[PDB]
């Protein structure tokens, strides 16, 4: 029958590893680097676009940074198509929670449910896992500002600063070197760009190869604002820090 | 039908009549309206004969599976709630049962649970259920004290069924007595109203409405 | 390679090796024939007498569909029975809706589409039978032969099994020598002879002859088994021809 052609996507190696999760992580390691840095008064999401072409429309583009609700955003590393499936599920889960409780979903609950979906693809169904790692940047009235990451295994952890995709080894050493707890958003913005600038496989880091977003309480009095940076705004912030 | 169970110092007293009717027709005067689920558990039956008989028998199977699985006798609360959750699934179907789950366990002590077919589940010290529940209540309530002796409690339970057996057209036959202690239930015999009435009337000097 | 390990897989030739392998199981089976005649069809089959312990006349291989169709097959006998069971369901549902008994060409495609369906998936095995069948409908007599692939044609004469080449050679002579047509009672006697001649390719064990026939004049358009005097008459005719 069909047994002959079954890859058996949801089995253990003799060593006790999940082949397809390991190979999906190897896939993500070639994806454009995405950095999340959590400050005391906001979160920064930075992401390097994969080797850009000069004729790519940069302003009306969304590859790396997506909005889940008014209080939560994600940075993507891996298959964009796979990420969009999970994002639409996450967006619905957030509205289901609001409809039920008349309260915006706490960040961890949304992250756990999305991570629990990924877990399912590793244990049953005989389908390939989602070749996607997320950096969740969000705010709720319980824990305040929160960074998380999830990976194809369906395992998620909380962070102060984290990288996913390419050159995470090099990126995590540089973040671990220059990060501190009393850091401000404007400082975190500078760290994020300086990290990408050194770990980039490109010759020089430019505005057209970057996506950038901040989640501040920089709105008017006790309310959160999401800012997905425009091309001209990334160009300005790149000159302001003195990278170009 | 008339069934009553009440809690006192000596434990729990359970008295039931023995008559079953279809309209004004008396089908039988020799019906066991108490089921012995286990040595420490008793079930009382009122309403549909089949409904009570079938589902209380079924409960006994569920109580046995509990003590096989959990290596421990089921609580009166858990036993009563299996039955109340079952009838609640059938709510609106037209099940007619008025039952009392009476037993002793270590953690609970002597316990009575009223369970009926519209899903009502009540813990309590006194319950009377049936067409002659009011007639039983009248005698039971007016004579009831917590400090009754096992002898007096058994008699009051018996006399309360007799009272209903008399006035209620749809209650009678015989009185079946039970006494639930920490050591389990004890059967205190079948008492035909045919003989019991005249015996009580003569000895007690009551029932002066009747031509002696 | 490995193209032959799974059903419904095309080889680089454009062949389904699993169907060709099912044909080998048919070639291995006992000889069965069909003879189209003037106003009907005649079916005959070789029944190898493995042992003296086989009850004569009580291991019937020819099957009836509805009341007017006869089916006989060579190869895996159970596969043949499964195909006839399907044929009986198809013929019942046709009569139920359209009132009229199922025409033979209509019936032929009902089997054809079903056998073909078992070459479309690797989750099913092709049928290990070539099925010779036919009968009498409103348009007259029809004989068909259906193969594991789902391939079927109308035939003047049909043969399948171990003695197919011997039977075919003998069938080709009848078609040549009787262009105007063969009568129902004649075809029964010829059917006997051809089974006896085709038995030369299977001559270790001696055999038992079984004949059936549909004929508008002889059987009133219904399928009946050839038994008693008519059967012994046909056997005696065949015994005379081999000597």
């Amino acid at each position: 029958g069909s047994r002959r052609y079954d890859s058996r996507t949801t089995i253990f190696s003799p060593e006790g590893r999940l082949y397809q999760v390991e190979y999906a992580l190897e896939s993500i390691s070639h994806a454009g680097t995405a950095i999340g840095i959590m400050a005391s008064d906001g979160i920064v999401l930075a992401a390097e676009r994969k080797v850009t072409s000069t004729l790519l429309e940069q302003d009306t583009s969304t590859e790396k940074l997506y909005k889940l609700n008014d209080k939560i955003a994600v940075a993507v590393a891996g298959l964009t198509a796979d990420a969009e499936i999970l994002i639409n599920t996450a967006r619905i889960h957030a509205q289901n929670y609001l409809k039920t409780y008349n309260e915006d979903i706490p960040v961890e609950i949304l992250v756990r449910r999305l991570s629990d979906i990924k877990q399912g693809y590793t244990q049953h169904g005989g389908l390939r896992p989602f070749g996607v790692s997320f950096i969740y940047a969000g705010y709720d009235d319980r824990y305040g500002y929160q960074l998380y990451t999830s990976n194809p295994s369906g395992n998620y952890t909380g962070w102060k600063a984290i990288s996913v995709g390419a050159n995470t080894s090099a990126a995590q050493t540089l973040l671990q070197m220059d990060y501190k707890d009393d850091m401000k958003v404007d400082d975190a913005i500078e760290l994020a760009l300086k990290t990408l600038s050194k770990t980039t496989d490109s010759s020089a880091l430019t505005y057209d190869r970057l996506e950038f977003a901040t989640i501040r309480k920089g709105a008017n009095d006790g309310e959160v604002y999401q800012k997905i940076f425009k091309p001209q705004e990334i160009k300005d912030i790149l000159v302001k820090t003195g990278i170009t | 039908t008339t069934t009553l169970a009440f809690r006192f110092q000596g434990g729990i007293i359970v008295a039931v009549d023995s008559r079953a009717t279809a309209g004004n027709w008396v089908a039988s005067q020799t019906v066991k309206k108490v089921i012995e689920i286990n040595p420490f558990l008793l079930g009382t039956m009122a309403g549909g004969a089949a409904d009570c008989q079938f589902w209380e028998t079924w409960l006994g199977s569920q109580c046995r599976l509990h003590e096989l699985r959990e290596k421990e006798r089921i609580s009166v609360a858990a036993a009563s709630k299996i039955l109340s959750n079952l009838v609640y699934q059938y709510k609106g179907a037209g099940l007619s049962m008025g039952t009392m789950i009476c037993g002793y366990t270590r953690k609970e002590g002597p316990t009575i649970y009223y369970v009926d077919s519209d899903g009502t589940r009540l813990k309590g010290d006194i319950f009377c259920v049936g067409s002659g529940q009011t007639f039983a209540y009248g005698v039971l309530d007016s004579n009831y004290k917590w400090d009754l002796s096992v002898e007096d409690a058994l008699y009051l339970g018996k006399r309360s069924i007799l009272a209903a057996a008399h006035r209620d057209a749809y209650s009678g036959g015989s009185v079946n007595l039970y006494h639930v202690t920490e050591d389990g239930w004890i059967y205190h015999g079948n008492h035909d109203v045919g003989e019991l009435f005249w015996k009580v009337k003569e000895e007690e000097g009551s029932f002066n409405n009747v031509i002696g | 390679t490995g193209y032959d390990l799974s059903n419904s897989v095309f080889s680089p030739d454009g062949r389904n090796f699993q169907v060709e392998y099912a044909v080998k199981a048919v070639e291995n089976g006992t000889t069965s024939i069909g003879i189209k005649c003037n106003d009907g069809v005649v079916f005959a089959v070789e029944k190898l007498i493995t042992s003296k312990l086989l009850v004569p006349q009580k291991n019937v291989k020819i099957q009836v569909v509805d009341r007017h169709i006869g089916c006989v097959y060579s190869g895996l006998i159970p596969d043949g029975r499964h195909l006839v069971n399907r044929g009986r369901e198809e013929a019942a549902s046709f009569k139920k809706l359209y009132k009229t008994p199922i025409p033979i060409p209509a019936f032929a495609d009902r089997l054809g589409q079903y056998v073909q369906a078992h070459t479309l998936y690797n989750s099913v095995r092709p049928f290990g039978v070539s099925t010779i069948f036919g009968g009498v409908d409103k348009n007259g007599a029809h004989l068909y032969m259906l193969e594991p692939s789902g391939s079927y044609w109308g035939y003047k004469g049909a043969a399948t099994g171990k003695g197919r080449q011997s039977a075919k050679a003998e069938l080709e002579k009848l078609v040549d020598h009787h262009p105007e047509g063969l009568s129902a009672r004649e075809a029964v006697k010829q059917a006997a002879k051809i089974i006896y001649l085709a038995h030369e390719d299977n001559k270790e064990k001696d055999f038992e002859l079984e004949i059936s026939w549909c004929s508008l004049s002889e059987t009133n358009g219904l399928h009946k088994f050839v038994k008693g005097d008519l059967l012994q008459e046909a056997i005696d005719f065949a015994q005379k021809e081999i000597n």
Binding site: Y23, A24, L55, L56, E57 | - | -
Partner: protein, 250 residues
């Protein structure tokens, strides 16, 4: 019987490659060159009509398809895979949008729905990916004119101009030199024909070239009058004659 293939036929290799997507892209590479150029006041999508036989009527085979009145699509790779995607793309524009909001979906959202269908063929049980890359040109009131590429993976990118298939490398280099942000629709059509001539080898005329635009509303193509708000489709397929006119001033 029944679909026993309830497991993925696309899985990760040790290197992290998704073989069947890479091989689907190889099938697109072999496919005939198609391109799209975005102007200020419209979009152009074009492709060569590779005729299987000179007896075949290449008019019957439409490589450039209308999805909505204001959205068009062209491809490179396997034509059959493209045809069923156009059928699904047209239906999803109705079921998942028009039957809910009483208006046609904007370009980016229809593209997103097509991408979702192609992504599912990448992960669902007992299916290979689609062996096509789509170029979807479209207009909507709030986004204006837009051009999108959709790859077998289900990934989509917005383009100012691009090419896909056989001679895409050379075609993209050509478009980079010619494209500016002040191109009028007629200038974009002119460049589209110049770019496509490089990749085309045999005949180059209105019968071997398929070209459509997303431009101004066409009231004449609407089919009715009386409703002022309904002004007609922005998608228009250029005729064999209309192409040959522009090939003289080339």
């Amino acid at each position: 019987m029944t679909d026993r293939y309830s497991f993925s036929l696309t899985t990760f290799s040790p290197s992290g490659k998704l073989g069947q997507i890479d091989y689907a892209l190889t099938a697109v590479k072999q496919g005939v060159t198609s391109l799209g150029i975005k102007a200020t006041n419209g979009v152009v999508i074009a492709t060569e009509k590779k005729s299987s036989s000179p007896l075949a009527m290449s008019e019957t085979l439409s490589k450039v398809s209308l999805l909505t009145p204001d959205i068009g699509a062209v491809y490179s790779g396997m034509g059959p895979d493209y045809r069923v995607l156009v059928d699904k793309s047209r239906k999803v524009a109705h079921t998942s949008y028009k039957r809910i909001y009483g208006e046609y979906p904007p370009t980016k959202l229809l593209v997103s729905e097509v991408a979702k269908i192609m992504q599912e063929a990448t992960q669902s049980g007992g299916v290979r990916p689609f062996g096509v890359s789509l170029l979807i040109a479209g207009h909507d009131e709030f986004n204006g004119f837009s051009l999108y590429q959709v790859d077998p993976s289900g990934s989509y990118f917005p383009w100012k101009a691009t090419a896909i298939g056989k001679g895409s490398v050379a075609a993209k280099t050509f478009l980079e030199k010619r494209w500016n942000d002040e191109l009028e629709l007629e200038d974009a059509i002119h460049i589209a024909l110049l770019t496509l001539k490089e990749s085309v080898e045999g005949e180059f005329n209105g019968d071997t070239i398929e070209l459509a635009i997303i431009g101004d509303e066409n009231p004449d193509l609407l089919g009715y009058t009386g409703i002022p708000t309904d002004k007609g489709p922005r998608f228009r397929k250029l005729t064999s004659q209309e192409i040959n006119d522009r090939l003289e001033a080339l």
